[PDB]
Nucleic acid binder design. Structure first.
Lengths: 74, 177, 52, 130, 108
RNA sequence: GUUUGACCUCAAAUCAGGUAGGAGUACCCGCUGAACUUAAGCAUAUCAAUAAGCGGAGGAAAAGAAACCAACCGGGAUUGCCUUAGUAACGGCGAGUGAAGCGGCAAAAGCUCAAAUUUGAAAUCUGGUACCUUCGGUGCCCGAGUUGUAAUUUGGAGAGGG
RNA sequence: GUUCUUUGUAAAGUGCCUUCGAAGAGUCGAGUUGUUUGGGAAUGCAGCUCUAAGUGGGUGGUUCCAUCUAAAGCUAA
RNA sequence: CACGGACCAAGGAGUCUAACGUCUAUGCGAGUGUUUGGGUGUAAAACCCAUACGCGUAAUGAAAGUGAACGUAGGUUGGGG
RNA sequence: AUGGUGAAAACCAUCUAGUAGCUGGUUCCUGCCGAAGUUUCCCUCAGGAUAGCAG
């Protein structure tokens, strides 16, 4: 993997653009509310059950943290 | 161009935009026949990355199948019987219901002179590709036949009947071993 | 069909046999016993010039 | 057999094909020097050693220059278009050999080619002409 | 129960196949110039065998290009790597000797 | 403009050009799938990823240019043979079942898309028609095609220029 | 071998220097019901539920390292 | 007891193969085995052979190891010759 | 059992040369040697595991 998969400004732009325009899926709609009320602990539990592995649920909850923080402030 | 944006838009399937498109189209495709021709592919980015050129000779049949043998291969087999002159190239998922699943199987006319010419697609005209779906030589057929590379696919790599006949029939030489 | 038609032989034993068979060609009495009307031939083993 | 029984019985005949001699004695086809120097009584590998040329580049499994000079004998033995030439005539008569001026020119050098492109084509032009 | 009665038959088949390939590919040596490779696994590493194809690196170091290498009858592999130094040296010498031997006919 | 005109969709025809069925079936590719019989009665092991049935191909088919094997001073598409080997491994360890990498050989051949703009000019193709040197070429007209047909690229990189 | 025509600021190749440089999702995976095997790390497949990532992802070797790039296709012997 | 036999001709039943041994013969011998193959051939014969592999050649153990001369490879007693 | 044909419970074709704790039969001559009718546990009932007699 010399050609591993560099950042690519265009791909980052498209992914984040679609991330907002699509909205939020029903489990994620539940999940973002579950962060604000029940904390990040129980959020990771529901996300691990919903998705396959925990390694997926980490990056997923981390993405939700980035979405919430950037929305309200800026 | 747009195919990167569509590629990423088709990822978020249960998202608000694509969720709405599903519930309209699922109603619309139930109004029409079981097997019928769509004029253009609904997910054109997927059509391309499965080998569809928007030129004369390519046909996009939409097909409906029951839920609960594989459904993708059954979808291809149903259009194979109806559109017998055509050759099945590939198929893909578009929409699903609680009771039915929909696929937009792409076809090529080997008889049409626009395909008999260009060398990128004239391979399908060769009689060795008559009913690719009826022999599991499509994407989904090769998937269900367990044909890949690895330790996982040892007992079913080059024909599961071929490896059985090889292992369970005695072989003898002129000068015995 | 799968009867044992061909016979595997030791390569050395096979070579021994041909050497014995060659050795017996230069005996003259052994040739006469085998058949071969070799009464009126000049000598054994009979060697003719290369121009043959 | 069912079908073979009819074909022996019929007055149509059989499509008799005698093609077993031709499967062994194959004529060489791709080189005339070889076509003259190839003993068909010999095999493939024996013919190669007779010529000199190698028949196999790997170490072969199992066990085992009159012509080659004639191959070395046969080893011993592009212009510009009308518009291109006439266009180069226009450039040479206008500037001379000022390639910097020639590529910063707009009217005669329309396709904005580099110094190296124009001078190379002028060198070819100066060979066919003055 | 299969029996190989055709052992003698198929050798004559294979020989005549080589004879046709000799007749059609007249001056050329039937097979491509294969590399020299060190075998895998502790058991066989002492053995040095014929590899599949060279590399872009071995071809580039020899003094010719990859696409041109195939037209002169050098088998080129692209997934094989040059980890060992001694193998690399042996293959480069093999190509350079081969290039001194070859006589590539003109297209006129 | 209470006309009319673009498209999209649904139609139509004893129109023009096509094509699919059926037979054969040894081999191949899929789908479906018993029982007599073996270990003690039979749910697995076992007959058997069989026979019959069904669908589909060809002169072969299938497979195939790695999301591979390895643990080495690394191999390098696939297929077949020899061997690995009756080994690893599994099996009320029992009827027994049964590989694979390496090695020797047979034969060897690699490539095409989708991917970021031709944007100083859809550079492409179908069909009709008129001729010509007719498994086709050319002119003209028509349609397809920007919801993308050509050229350039496929990680072995590649492209832009100099 | 014998000729008739080759064109257009046409088509590539090679080395150096400079500026960029996108690779497949209802798929991978996850649980379960069956089928497949002699398969011990449910192997392979299907059905059903949920369903990703891009200094990524898949597979293996004792804390790293090696190895390829799926979810598209063609191809003789 | 019983089962078989009206008579005659012809047909008619321990075979072939694989796996594993027994003994004998032959070849060579710490080695041995050409015949998957390649070369060659008067052509399914015969004749040659590369690299490997099979089995044997040096043992004592259970995870980890070690390694066979105090020696006319022994001292005695017998023991074909 | 599979697949088929007939019909106010059947037959045909393959699997299937199915499986036998058995019945009947087993094909030339001569010479030479020549029994056993049973020991002990595996339990025996079945098949054997062994000793004995003949080489």
């Amino acid at each position: 993997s010399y050609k591993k998969g560099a950042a690519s400004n265009r791909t980052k732009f498209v992914r984040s653009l679609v991330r907002e325009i699509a909205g939020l899926s029903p489990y994620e709609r539940r999940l973002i509310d579950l962060i604000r009320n029940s904390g990040e602990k129980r959020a990771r539990k529901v996300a691990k059950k919903r998705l396959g592995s925990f390694t997926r649920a980490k990056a997923k909850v981390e993405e939700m943290n980035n979405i919430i923080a950037a929305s309200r402030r800026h | 161009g747009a195919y990167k944006y569509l590629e990423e838009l088709q990822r978020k399937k249960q998202s608000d935009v694509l969720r709405f498109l599903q519930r309209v189209r699922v109603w619309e495709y139930r109004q029409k026949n079981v097997i019928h021709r769509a004029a253009r592919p609904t997910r054109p980015d997927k059509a391309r990355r499965l080998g569809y050129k928007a030129k004369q000779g390519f046909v996009i049949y939409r097909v409906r199948v029951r839920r609960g043998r594989s459904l993708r291969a059954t979808a291809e087999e149903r259009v194979g019987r109806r559109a017998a002159n055509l050759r099945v190239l590939n198929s893909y998922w578009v929409n699903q219901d609680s009771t039915y699943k929909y696929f937009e199987v792409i076809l090529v006319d080997p008889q049409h002179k626009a395909i008999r010419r260009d060398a990128r697609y004239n391979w399908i005209c060769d009689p060795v590709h008559k009913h690719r779906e009826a022999r599991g030589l499509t994407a989904t057929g090769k998937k269900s036949r367990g044909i890949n590379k690895g330790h996982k696919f040892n007992n079913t790599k080059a024909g599961r009947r071929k490896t059985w006949k090889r292992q369970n029939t005695l072989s003898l030489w002129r000068y015995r071993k | 069909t799968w009867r044992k038609w061909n016979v595997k032989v030791n390569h050395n034993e096979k070579r021994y046999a041909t050497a014995s068979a060659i050795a017996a060609t230069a005996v003259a009495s052994l040739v006469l016993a085998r058949g071969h009307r070799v009464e009126k031939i000049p000598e054994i083993p009979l060697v003719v010039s290369t121009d043959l | 057999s069912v079908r073979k029984r009819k074909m022996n019985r019929s007055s149509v005949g059989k499509a008799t094909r005698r093609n077993k001699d031709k499967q062994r004695k194959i004529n060489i086809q791709s080189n005339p020097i070889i076509a003259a120097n190839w003993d068909y009584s010999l095999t493939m590998a024996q013919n190669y050693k007779k010529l000199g040329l190698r028949a196999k580049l790997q170490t072969p499994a199992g066990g085992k220059e009159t012509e080659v000079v004639k191959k070395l004998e046969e080893l011993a033995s592009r212009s510009q278009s009308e518009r291109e030439e006439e266009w180069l005539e226009k450039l040479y008569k206008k500037h001379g050999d000022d390639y910097k001026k020639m590529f910063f020119d707009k009217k005669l050098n329309i396709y904005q080619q580099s110094e190296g492109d124009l001078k190379r084509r002028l060198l070819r032009w100066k060979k066919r002409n003055g | 129960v299969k029996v190989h009665f055709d052992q003698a038959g198929k050798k004559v088949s294979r020989r005549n196949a080589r004879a046709t390939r000799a007749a059609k590919i007249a001056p050329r040596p039937l097979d491509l110039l294969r590399p020299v490779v060190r075998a895998p696994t502790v058991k066989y590493n002492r053995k040095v065998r014929a590899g599949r194809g060279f590399t872009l690196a071995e071809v580039k170091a020899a003094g010719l290009t990859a696409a041109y290498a195939r037209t002169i009858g050098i088998a080129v592999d692209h997934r094989r790597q040059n980890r060992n130094q001694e193998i690399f040296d042996a293959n480069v010498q093999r190509l350079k000797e081969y290039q001194s031997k070859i006589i590539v006919f003109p297209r006129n």
